[PDB]
Amino acid sequence: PLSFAQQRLWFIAQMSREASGAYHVPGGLRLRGELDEVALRAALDRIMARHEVLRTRFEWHEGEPVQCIDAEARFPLVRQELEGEAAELAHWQQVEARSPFDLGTGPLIRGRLLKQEHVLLLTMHHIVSDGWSMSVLAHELGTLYRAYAQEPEVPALPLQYADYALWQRRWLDGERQQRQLAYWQQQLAGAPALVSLPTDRPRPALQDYRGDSIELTFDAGLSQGLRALSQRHGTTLYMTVLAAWAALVARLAGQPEVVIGTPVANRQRAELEGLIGFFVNTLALRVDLGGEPSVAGLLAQVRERVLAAQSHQDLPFEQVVEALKPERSLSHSPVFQLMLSWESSPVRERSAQFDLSLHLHEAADGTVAGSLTYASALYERETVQRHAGYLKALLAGMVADDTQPVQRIGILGEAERHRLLVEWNDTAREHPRTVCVHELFEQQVERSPDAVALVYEGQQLSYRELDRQANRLARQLKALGVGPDERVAVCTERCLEMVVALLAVLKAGGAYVPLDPGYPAERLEYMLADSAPKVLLRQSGQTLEPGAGVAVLALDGEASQPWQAQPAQRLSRDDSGVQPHHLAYVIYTSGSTGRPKGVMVEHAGVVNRLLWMQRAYGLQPQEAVLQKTPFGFDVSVWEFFWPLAVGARLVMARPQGQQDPAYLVETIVGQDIGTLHFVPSMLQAFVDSEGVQRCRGVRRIVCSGEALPGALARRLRQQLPQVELHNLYGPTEATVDVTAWACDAAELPDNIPIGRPVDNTTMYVLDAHGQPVPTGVAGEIHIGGVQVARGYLGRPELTRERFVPDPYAGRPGARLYKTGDLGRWLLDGTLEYLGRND
Ligand SMILES: Nc1ncnc2c1ncn2[C@@H]1O[C@H](COP(=O)(O)O)[C@@H](O)[C@H]1O
């Protein structure tokens, strides 16, 4: 656990170390033949004196750096002889390119050799070489050894690198540099500053240069098909791969435009092709994927922008970045974060200057091979391998049909597709298919009839007492026409009679409609008329009048005494006639602006939601739950019926009690509350409230409704180290909650996942065309399974738009709910909430 200054200074110190080796040009060469250590010195010294760059040093001389060219050129070759094989070669080769040079005075190109089988290692500094110059140096060394092996004084160089540098000084000052600057500032203006590729970990504040790589090859079949495809469109094999990778990245990142950089040799004139020195320049290629282009159309755009880029390749890329004046970040590279390098007809790269670096070359077999180098801090290895699979899949689709929309080509492999759709939705759990919500309570009454069921301000009802009260009212409801799918509105503040009413409606075979008296009269009257209930159960004191032939029964007070004359025996299953597919409640949701919609929720889904909750958290009969949520919110559904189904007691909070910080803590302590709910905003008030640390008896805090910030979860641990924090997600249209995540990791992330689907529930992250997206890609959350509600009461058109057929359940008639929520799968099979679709 380092401090902030130490962690910063560590990343600052280790950034320089890994980047210190990134300014070298290594190269290996195995020498087979006769042991000819005599014919090697003249071939190495002649090549040194041939290129005045290799024997050039640099000094300070009053304000600016200057070049100090020397006369004689001697080669600094260290000699050894190793016993161990693989482990020894990798160690000597690593420190060969890792041991720094002396740019001040001394050599800048080293060498090591050891043994009729030798190994000539060569390493140059980037200020006097590059990738092209390394192969030219080995090209020259092979000829000079051959001329020695047959024959002294071994074609002369046509131009000096200082002549190139002197020409560049005038060109940078000329008006051709100003035109090339004007084009690049035009081409890259307003381009996206940072690619939003899905990362397995959040981006570090300081760019971590730790890298790794994977190997990828295109077989001869795909390689030939890409050659033929590119021939049809007048593009090179590089333009085709560039077009594919950009389309893939734009699709994965959810961005319309993608900027990909490419190292260019920058030896335009045929005069500098044999020269050694720093010549590479970088070009930033802005590829647009908007408008759903076709494979042919995208290839035409890339072909034009690559040709336009290669015409303006003299301008140094540093002057492009300086002109664009971007918000330079310490966390990512400027202008682009992805590089594609292409070699034509080395050690494993562990340094990552960019997020992804795709290196590809054309092999001898006609196949295309290379590597994909990734930043270890951002991506796991399996993510990068899936990324490489997408590219190969996208390339194959471009060959199979170059007229289709490029952004709709299938890229998912069958393994990942089956994992997303099936494996991560393996939630089937057998439950009694004929049990209704109230029957869960009735089964518990028989097990513990004298146990405490309800507590409200010094009043108590046992399980038997509560069941008999509900039976009496349920028989009165039956006498007023309450039955399957019929609604019973309930208007009351919290009290014992609130739970009597809810249980009585379910026992009578109907569905309850909660009417919170705190809402405006106009709102209550709309819901009362929209639901068209048979009966209105009303607390004494409430003045809500339905008219319209609706029967009004008093819920408490002297006016409720008549239905106490009803027998307290239970109604038979044939008397109420209710079944799990019948409605249990209609709870109105606002959604946005306009009239609220009544969500019709059936018994079977509620039973499944309650049975899962007990399996996951194991509420015991001696525990207490706090009823603090307004009963017009469906979170109250499990507050009511979870403890009553398992034997625990439900403590009804004082009306508007959760808004008093003193009352909440005092009630938690005074009543031994073990489980309660918070929306994240009110959990913040709880952890900031006086005396929250007194609540060490709390067992479970369930959080839902809003995004749960990781900092709040971590803050709750410091205040109540014993409490289990659980993040639950779900809309009303899918029965309260459909995913859950326990916040029990030793280190909690800033984005707390919403978790994994609950029992008999499926989750899908789909694109605009209803197709599953790769792991980590954002898409719209769709919910399947038994908890999907029946629909919106009296809104068949809206029901049809949001409750769509389920093509993935493998059973006819199944339906999905389109949530309007954005989410993504994490690589560990957990879901992450990202926001609203609009
Ligand atoms: N754990 C959660 N994290 C983020 N948003 C949530 C969570 N739970 C619920 N929501 C949001 O609340 C909506 C449902 O609210 P409601 O239907 O009023 O219960 C969801 O569609 C989400 O937008």
Is residue 750 a known part of a binding site?
Answer: no
**Residue 161: count of CB within 10 angstroms of its CB:** 21
Nearest CA to ligand 1 atom 15: 731
Q: Among the atoms of ligand 1, which is closest to the Cα of residue 727?
A: 1
User: Pocket around ligand 1: residues whose beta carbon is below 6 Å from it?
Assistant: 589, 704-708, 727-729, 731-732, 754, 819, 821, 833
Cα within 13 Å of Cα(231), Cβ side:
6
Q: What token pair was written down for 580?
A: 């799990």
Is 137 known as a binding-site position?
Answer: no
Report the candidate in 681, 711, 716 with the shortest Cα–Cα distance to residue 701: 716
The Cα-based distances of 371 to 107, 155, 624 in angstroms read: 32, 36, 59
How many degrees, rounded to 5, is the angle at CA 283 between CA 281 and CA 287?
165
List the structure tokens of 380.
């796991």
Pocket test for ligand 1, best of 832, 833, 834 (most atoms within 8 A of CB): 833
For 4-162, CATH number out of 3.30.559.10, 3.50.50.60, 3.40.50.1220, 3.60.15.10 equals 3.30.559.10
Count of Cβ atoms closer than 10 Å to residue 166 Cβ: 11
In this structure, the residue with its CA closest to atom 20 of ligand 1 is 731
Sequence letter at residue 106: G
In ligand 1, the atom with minimum distance to the C-alpha of 739 is: 1
Helix (H, G, I), strand (E, B) or coil at 820: strand
Indicate the resolution in Å: 2.2
- Whole-number Å distance, alpha carbon 704 to ligand 1 midpoint, is 7
State CA 50 to chain mean position distance: 54
Closest CA to 213 of 366, 24, 394, 355: 355
Q: Where are the alpha helices (DSSP H) in 761-803?
A: 796-802
E strands along 655-772, which residues? 675-678, 700-703, 724-729, 739-742, 756-757, 761-766
**Tokens 């996208």 identify what position?**
394
- Residue 728 pairs in a beta bridge with 740
Q: From the CA of 475, how far away is ligand 1's center (Å)?
A: 37
Method: X-ray
Q: How many CB atoms lie within 10 A of CB 746?
A: 4
Q: Token pair of 52, please?
A: 């005045």
Strand-pairing partners, residue 282, are: 263
Annotated binding-site residue? 236: no
CA–CA separation, 30 vs 43, rounded Å? 16
Query: Is residue 619 classed as helix, strand or coil in its secondary structure?
Result: coil
d(CA 577, ligand 1 centre) in Å? 34
From the CA of 753, how far away is ligand 1's center (Å)?
Answer: 13
Q: Which atom of ligand 1 is nearest the CA belonging to 635?
A: 19
List strand residue ranges (DSSP E) for 659-723, in order: 675-678, 700-703
* 716 token code pair: 């709750």
Q: What sections of 480-582 are H helices per DSSP?
A: 496-507, 521-531, 573-576
Helix (H) or strand (E) segment spanning residue 705: none
Residue 412: HSE in the Cβ half-sphere, 13 Å Cα cutoff: 18
Could you identify the atom of ligand 1 that is nearest to the CA of residue 781?
21
Task: Find out whether 648 and 619 touch, Cβ atoms under 8 Å.
Answer: yes
The backbone region for 456, taken as left when phi is positive above 0, alpha when psi lies in -120 to 50, beta otherwise, is: beta
Give φ, ψ of 524 to 5 degrees. -60, -35
**Residue 818 contacts residue 799 (beta carbons within 8 Å):** no
Question: Do the annotations mark residue 373 as ligand-binding?
Answer: no
Cβ neighbours around 401 below 10 Å, total: 12
**705 CA to middle of ligand 1, Å?**
4
Where helices occur in 21-116 by DSSP H, the ranges are 41-50, 86-98
HEC letters along 549-573:
CCEEEECCCHHHHHHHHCCCCCCCH
Residue whose CA is closest, atom 5 of ligand 1? 706
Ligand 1 atom 21: residue of nearest CA: 731
275 is in an annotated binding site: no
Q: At what angle do helices 496-507 and 463-478 cross, to 10 degrees?
A: 50
Q: How far, in Å, is the centroid of ligand 1 from the Cα of 567?
A: 42
Among residues 75, 77, 57, the alpha carbon closest in space to that of 67 is found at: 57
Q: What is the CA(495)–ligand 1 centre distance, in A?
A: 27
DSSP per-residue codes, 306-365: HHHHHHT-SS-HHHHHHHH-----SSS-SS-SEEEEEE---PPP-B-SSSEEEEEEE-TT
Could you give the CA distance from residue 353 to residue 120 in angstroms, rounded to a whole number?
28
Nearest CA, atom 23, ligand 1: 821
Distance 10 CA to ligand 1 centre (A): 40
Question: Helix, strand or coil for residue 537?
Answer: strand
Q: Is 730 annotated as a binding residue?
A: yes
- 819 Cα nearest atom in ligand 1: 21
Q: For residues 287 and 185, what is the distance between their CA atoms, to the nearest angstrom?
A: 15
Residue with the two structure tokens 């809500």: 544
